[PDB]
């Protein structure tokens, strides 16, 4: 019930254009309810209740489950956490063998973590997905990660990403996310590095990201001020520096 | 369920009594379970035949004493008859 409905309409427009998008906005405006509104809008558009994967850290896994429970309880929610007995029980629970769209299905909402994706590389290589949403994407900043290679090997071709700040390291991570958006276009980092520096960098990523700042609504959130307190060391904390520098 | 008979806990905590900081696996429990009923039927048979050779109709400490003095090659019998006699004297003491 905000501007983010029109933002997800723009997301549906770029979904119609066929290019996966990156949301580079800071957390605090409720991207989870907008993501499930995207889910409900696509289910109203092309009638899909089936494969929907949510990649989410273990701190926010139950938060995502609670949000999708209280906000949109129409779908069926299935979690993925626990022991090996629960692992094979849930492996029985999503046996499927029926692609495209199903209505009376138990895999409507599927939430999982990065470590349980990573430890099931031989298991998750099957059951090719139609939609993955990855939340808190600061852990895939490097292309040397095994989780990054495991998420590269999937057979879904849909890479919508949720993060708070994707600008952690603007040397390799931008090429990595552009490669995850379209693996066909970007495969070599040398052509990205070789192809005035500050002005020309903004126009590269212009049509993908959206431009939203936190200071556009009624600022009743608190207007968080920063107070830095600077103190002096104690004599117990003084000679320990010379102790640690003595042996060097 | 079924009431399975096994002396795995007995061997487990004599292991714990003599080696307080040593672990063990379930295949080991099965493997010396096979050991102890192997020797249990072997020496239960031995004494049986022997006593029947002696034409005695029972099994007291005497038949099994000569059976364990006769059967195994050495050393373990030399400690075994002494510790078994000490065991039956603490029984008759009690």
């Amino acid at each position: 019930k905000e501007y983010q409905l029109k933002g997800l309409n723009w997301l549906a427009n770029l979904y119609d254009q066929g290019i996966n998008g990156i949301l580079a906005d800071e957390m605090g405006l409720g991207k989870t309810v907008q993501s499930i509104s995207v889910l409900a809008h696509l289910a109203e558009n092309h009638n899909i209740w089936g494969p929907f994967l949510v990649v989410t850290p273990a701190s926010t896994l139950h938060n995502w489950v609670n949000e999708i429970s209280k906000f949109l309880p129409q779908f069926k929610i299935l979690p993925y956490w626990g022991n090996a007995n629960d692992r094979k029980v849930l492996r029985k629970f999503w046996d499927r063998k029926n692609l495209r769209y199903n209505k009376n299905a138990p895999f409507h909402v599927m939430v999982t973590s990065y470590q349980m994706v990573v430890t099931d590389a031989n298991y998750l290589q099957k059951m090719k997905w139609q939609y993955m949403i990855l939340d808190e994407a600061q852990a895939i900043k490097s292309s040397q990660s095994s989780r990054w290679k495991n998420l590269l090997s999937f057979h879904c071709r849909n890479r919508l990403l949720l993060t708070g700040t994707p600008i952690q390291n603007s040397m390799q991570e931008l090429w990595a996310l552009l490669h995850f958006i379209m693996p066909s276009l970007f495969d070599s980092h040398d052509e990205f590095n070789e192809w005035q520096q500050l002005r020309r960098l903004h126009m590269i990523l212009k049509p993908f990201m959206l431009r939203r700042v936190k200071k556009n609504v009624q600022s009743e959130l608190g207007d968080k001020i920063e107070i830095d307190v600077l103190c002096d060391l104690t004599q117990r904390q003084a000679k320990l520096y010379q102790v640690l520098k003595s042996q060097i | 369920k079924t009431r399975k008979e096994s002396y795995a806990i007995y061997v487990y905590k004599v292991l714990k009594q003599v080696h307080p900081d040593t672990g063990i696996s379930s295949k080991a429990m099965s493997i010396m379970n096979s050991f102890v009923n192997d020797v249990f039927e072997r020496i239960a048979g031995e004494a049986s035949r022997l006593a029947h050779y002696n034409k005695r109709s029972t099994i007291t400490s005497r038949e099994i004493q000569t059976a364990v003095r006769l059967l195994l090659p050495g050393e373990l019998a030399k400690h075994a008859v002494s510790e078994g006699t000490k065991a039956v004297t603490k029984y008759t003491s009690a």
């Binding site: - | 008979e5 004599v14 003599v18 040593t22 672990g23 004494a47 008759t92 009690a94």
Partner: protein, 104 residues
């Protein structure tokens, strides 16, 4: 009040007495014979548990694999004669290479 505690022994004495009654060995069984059975059984497993323990700290492992009891049972001639004819599942071969078979 248990008879094993009265005998001062740890291996059970009522269990072996039960197995001796219906084990069809003798029609009459004395009182001291199951105690003697439990005593020699406790001595045998005490001896090879010492052997498995020193094999375990020789290989520096907290868990006694059956291979530990293979090189514990092949390091003494008394159990090399008592358990020489036996066949052990997952036992391997002890290290033994002839001097003539070695080159040079």
């Amino acid at each position: 009040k248990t008879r094993s505690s009265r005998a001062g022994l740890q291996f059970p004495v009522g269990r072996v007495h039960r197995l001796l009654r219906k084990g069809n060995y003798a029609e009459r069984v004395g009182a001291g014979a199951p105690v003697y059975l439990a005593a020699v059984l406790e001595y045998l497993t005490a001896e090879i548990l010492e052997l498995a323990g020193n094999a375990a700290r020789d290989n520096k492992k907290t868990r006694i694999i059956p291979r530990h009891l293979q090189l514990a049972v092949r390091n003494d001639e008394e159990l090399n004669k008592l358990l020489g004819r036996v066949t052990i599942a997952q036992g391997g071969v002890l290290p033994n290479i002839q001097s003539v078979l070695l080159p040079k």
